[PDB]
Amino acid sequence: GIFGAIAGFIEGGWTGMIDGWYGYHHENSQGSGYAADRESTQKAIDGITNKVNSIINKMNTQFEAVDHEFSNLERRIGNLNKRMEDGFLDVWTYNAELLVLLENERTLDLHDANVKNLYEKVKSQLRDNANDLGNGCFEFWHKCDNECMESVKNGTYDYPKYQKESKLNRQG
Amino acid sequence: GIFGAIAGFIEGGWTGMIDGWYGYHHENSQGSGYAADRESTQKAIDGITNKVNSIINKMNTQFEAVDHEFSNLERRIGNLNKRMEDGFLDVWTYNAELLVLLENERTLDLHDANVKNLYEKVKSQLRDNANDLGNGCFEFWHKCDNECMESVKNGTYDYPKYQKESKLNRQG
Amino acid sequence: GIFGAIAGFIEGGWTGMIDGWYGYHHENSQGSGYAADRESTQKAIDGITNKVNSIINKMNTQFEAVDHEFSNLERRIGNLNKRMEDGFLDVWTYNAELLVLLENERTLDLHDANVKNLYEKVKSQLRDNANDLGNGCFEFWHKCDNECMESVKNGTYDYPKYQKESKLNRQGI
Amino acid sequence: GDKICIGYHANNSTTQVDTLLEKNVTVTHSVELLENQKEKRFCKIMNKAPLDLKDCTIEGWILGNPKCDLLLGDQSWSYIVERPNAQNGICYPGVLNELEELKAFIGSGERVERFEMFPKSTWAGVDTSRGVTNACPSYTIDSSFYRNLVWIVKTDSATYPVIKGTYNNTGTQPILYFWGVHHPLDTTVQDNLYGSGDKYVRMGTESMNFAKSPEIAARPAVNDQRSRIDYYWSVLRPGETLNVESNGNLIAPWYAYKFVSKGAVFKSDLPIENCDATCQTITGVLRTNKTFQNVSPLWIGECPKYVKSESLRLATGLRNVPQIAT
Amino acid sequence: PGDKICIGYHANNSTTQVDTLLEKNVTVTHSVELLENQKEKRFCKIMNKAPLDLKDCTIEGWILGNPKCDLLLGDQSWSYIVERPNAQNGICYPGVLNELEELKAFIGSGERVERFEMFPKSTWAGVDTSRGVTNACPSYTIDSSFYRNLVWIVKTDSATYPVIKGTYNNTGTQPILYFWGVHHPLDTTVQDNLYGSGDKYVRMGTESMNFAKSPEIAARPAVNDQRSRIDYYWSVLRPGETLNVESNGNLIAPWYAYKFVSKKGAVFKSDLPIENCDATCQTITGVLRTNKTFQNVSPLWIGECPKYVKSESLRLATGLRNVPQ
Amino acid sequence: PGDKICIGYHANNSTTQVDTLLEKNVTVTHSVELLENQKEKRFCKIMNKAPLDLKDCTIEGWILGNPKCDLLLGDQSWSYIVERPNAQNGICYPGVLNELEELKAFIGSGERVERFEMFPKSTWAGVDTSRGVTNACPSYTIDSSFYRNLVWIVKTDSATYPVIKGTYNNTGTQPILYFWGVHHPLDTTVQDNLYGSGDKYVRMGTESMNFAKSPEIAARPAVNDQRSRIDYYWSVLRPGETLNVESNGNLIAPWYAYKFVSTNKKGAVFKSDLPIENCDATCQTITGVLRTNKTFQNVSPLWIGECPKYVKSESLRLATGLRNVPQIAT
């Protein structure tokens, strides 16, 4: 996809993650699971809702065709009216169809970026205290607590706190 | 924001950086301060100016309403003219308002990409002679002089020059 | 460019890479050459071809001007015809020209993205078994023959296999 | 060791969107913006019924064709429904002049009140009661005439004298009214019905002038008539006065309409039912909250935008890539 | 403790906002408003040329030569026309000016007219030219008068009304706009006293135009105490065309006409003042003095004006999202 | 030297540029021009149907049967009509063809006409058919002639122009396009000379149409050495309809008329001097043939057949490839 994460370096989505668009999967000696990242999920929902509403708002004017009759000496103006009405029909059909194709492209990109950006946020916190497996997964070189997992998710991860444990594990 | 830097992992802007859109904040024993990255800032100004000027140029034509009069036997053509002029009014009002919403979204993303690309530019110079903190800031593992900061801003930073000093403290 | 790779941290293109949009250049004791990344090139070709055909398809209606004559008591309706036909001409000229400027910007960005992602794909396989030279180039800290090169291009690069060799060499410098 | 992974939502959606880059992309969430469904009937708009013209055309109604007596009094409408196969219109052959502007003026209205504009006693010294024809039967009388007009003819006595009438619109509403000019097929009918000598119909208001004389000739038979009537209509503005003056061949205004002023005339088969709508198209009712519709460009009320599209589905969620289960 | 270098972006004191597809009310460091919503409520010169103020006259009153429109009378050049809504001097003798809307359109297309005598009164032999006045058409100095551009030809004291004839060959560069009429008496009595007995006609023709009309006698409702009417007519004699006039009686003769010279023309119906100022873009509701691309002032204008849209604001972000501390 | 792998992109010798919202004149490796600016300056056949070349005749001259237009006389079939801007042979006896614009509009939208005698000269009784000729309307062969589709009827040596009547009933499946006229003498003298004395009329009716006109006698400026005029008229007699003609005098009677077939194509009337050649086209504009795959064209808004959309643009080139940054060589 253009940021390379969705159906990219993260090969598939998670049906078990049901409470948001973007998220974390963790596995602990205390258990495992799928938890949405609420902030990026909600920001995305507000943005996408706004986009939908803006489009609806912008599209809320109508051209109105009319039922007028024309006589057998009014071929020119009758045809003028037809070409005019068909003309606006073609312009609005074009506007709506193109807009949908373009906005869908860009909406999928936005989702892809939001996933990419979460992944980058974790990678910079962990540094060499974790090993990058593929598929957007990190394996810690140290024991990672539920409390430690939450710190990674909320951006407070203490890299010094586990540096020595990690190094000893890393090249043991 | 889509590239994740502006209002993102770089949480706030700098009222102190007056002479550019994007740039650097340094701190060292000699002081602290701000410096715009002249090249990316100018390249952005150039692109943004071109966009603004393209939009104005494409919007240069005008549809002209006329206010001809119509008799009490010209209700149909009178109404035809009205619907015609209101139809073009609605199409241009739509074109202009949607284009502004779309282009504003993309311009904000452009700025976001430029900041991110600047961050990655520095990151790749510094390598492990510095620590990447979460926030777009790098803490040096060596002493970085005003000359040294300039070399970073310049793209001429010398990694081998400081590699041994950095290792000492990176493990010291 | 928006993703910063094309005309960016990778300064120039390769005229020697003839079989794809995006690719690898390699050099080892065995030899040197260019090779396109087939998968990313073909996905871009499909995507761009779809874009072109979608534009052509959405633009495939025509406003029709007409040859009708008007008399010296038909100034108003003659002018109504004129302002109407010109009105649709101006709308469609605007649509086409604006669309082309916008899609050209976005098409160039898409290419920039595909290069950057290809670079990040390699970078993350190689870890510290290789050194970043500038300009999107990696020098391996170990011997990398043709099968090793291909594994990088394939996505199958074996970092543990070479981690001891590259660590020893990385020290000695 | 312990894992933490980053990823995205998937679900069992099989709903697809198209993109500039790609077609048939399954997404987790999406919204269809277009309505393609309609109720094939006519309903009330603003809790106001439409006027069903039934077996009558607009001409047959508003001139008062004897077979349209069902429609005869006052009428209030939200829109007009004219049936394509309506057979009662202009019964005595001839042209209703400026037909199309008449039809556009009537469609602009929401109400009319029928009233006697010129009582038969207006016209001195002529016969007000013989003006019927086999071309205009009612359902019970073989020879009749339009309810809104009087076909004046000369008295048993030899001469048709100058007749005159005035109506002053002291009302607050415009008046839609009608008259005509009889064109006999030969000079023998002209002399029987009207006196010898050049005949004229003249009318004027503050802003209008009308003058016409009989164009005597035999036209192909239509409802057994080789003669013709030229029909006319006008609108008497509030404060305006109408003078009428003729010495023959006048089909006089009798009854007219106080007229009250977006409207529509739908030519359609569809039934009018005891139902309410906010959006009525010529091919049926839209009962929707969608932004676009491909049903019809012709409507009344508050409708979504007409486009030729089959579907306008917006991605809202992300590319759906659910794990494969065997 | 270590030295630091940080990558960052501009912020400032801006509280100027834009909307995007994704988000409303986003404060941004720099932006440009593309729409103009302000105007000078007055009429100015366009291209250094003054407009024509019709004052108390309608367009009809002006070019027919209504006696109370004399201040207008003679030669005019204009960048656009201003007709005042309550103007009272128009068609003074009741009647219809045929193809009026189309006349208004042709006049609107013009930039200048030169008034001249097309048919001197001596053109018509055997008839009275000095008596064609009415209390329906007073000037400011006489109770009974007539249009300056027309002659109401009447019977001589004796001999009835003869066939009268006139011609005019347009040798000029310019088209000629001219006017005439047919009088329609309320009575056969008025008909007989003014014109002869006998069937009357008014006939006109050029290389490309034919006109024929005879009177239609009836009492119309009284307007300006007149129950009679005039049918007024206008036409345009092309360069090189000749006009032939022939009448039995009931002719209201062309007397003076206009050499007419023909861009975008404007007849503004407005009460706004005309001031000694000068402008590039004149709207029916005022002057736009602006470099902006769009305007929400009016769709009706002359000059080089920005595009009309119904929008209240069209502000383009140029700077970034403003996030000051 | 250490083993290298580099990531990069294609470049080539392309010098073709595009514009974007952010940047003008970007050289790219691959692109598509979407707009066609090339045309063949000629008229071609459209549904394998040749257009009608009116040559030195106008549309009026043609369907009235101007004697100098006999080249076009008879049945005609066409995909469109080409009328030369300086054709000389139109209305030869001066006067107006009433509702002309709407007739020209009706004739475009036709694909074929069959000429036929509608009213034989015998139809009119007690009048002279054969004196109806003028100096204004020469044929190429004869100095004095008249339109092939009309009879200028004149009173015989007998003082009286009688009442004449004519009927034509359309039992056909096709509408009939037909013409008539009313002659306006310069003189009451010429009026007396040609027709009866007293009040004259031309009355015509169908089941849906009426017409009545009397002569309007006056001297007009000389055209084609004529101070008199003819009012010309046209109408369309629908399938199943009957026409009645009745006249006192001053009738220019319908003689030949046209069975008319309306078309399922646009169709078009082009005013132009371009050559018509033995060629086929899919897209015919008024200034030429487009033979193209492109989406847009800047040649003309006026056309018949399937043409690309008209825009004012000079070029509409879409980038498909990437920014082209070839190695500088020296």
Ligand SMILES: CC(=O)N[C@@H]1[C@@H](O)[C@H](O[C@@H]2O[C@H](CO[C@]3(C(=O)O)C[C@H](O)[C@@H](NC(C)=O)[C@H]([C@H](O)[C@H](O)CO)O3)[C@H](O)[C@H](O)[C@H]2O)[C@@H](CO)O[C@H]1O
């Ligand atoms: C009948 C005739 O010849 N009488 C003499 C007039 O012709 C002549 O006036 C001149 O008329 C000239 C036109 O002559 C034709 C014509 O070609 O237009 C001759 C035609 O045979 C005649 N046809 C019919 C059916 O009448 C035709 C027609 O009458 C007119 O068009 C109706 O106006 O006229 C030409 O216009 C000359 O400019 C004109 O002087 C007069 C004067 O010498 O004498 C008559 O004896």
Ligand SMILES: *[C@@H]1O[C@H](CO)[C@@H](O)[C@H](O)[C@H]1NC(C)=O
């Ligand atoms: C770059 O930095 C050096 C010090 O590092 C300084 O003297 C020089 O002027 C700077 N100039 C550039 C690279 O533009």
Ligand SMILES: *[C@@H]1O[C@H](CO)[C@@H](O)[C@H](O)[C@H]1NC(C)=O
């Ligand atoms: C026209 O032809 C049909 C068939 O002969 C006939 O029934 C009809 O009466 C004709 N019209 C007239 C007026 O005779």
Ligand SMILES: *[C@@H]1O[C@H](CO)[C@@H](O)[C@H](O)[C@H]1NC(C)=O
């Ligand atoms: C905002 O900034 C401008 C330029 O710095 C300054 O001139 C102005 O005084 C400031 N506005 C306020 C907050 O008054």
Ligand SMILES: *[C@@H]1O[C@H](CO)[C@@H](O)[C@H](O)[C@H]1NC(C)=O
């Ligand atoms: C009018 O004058 C012009 C030039 O003097 C002349 O050529 C033309 O014949 C005249 N028109 C007529 C028919 O009198």
Ligand SMILES: *[C@@H]1O[C@H](CO)[C@@H](O)[C@H](O)[C@H]1NC(C)=O
């Ligand atoms: C290229 O640039 C020239 C001027 O540099 C300009 O005239 C032309 O329009 C531009 N066109 C393209 C797309 O090359």
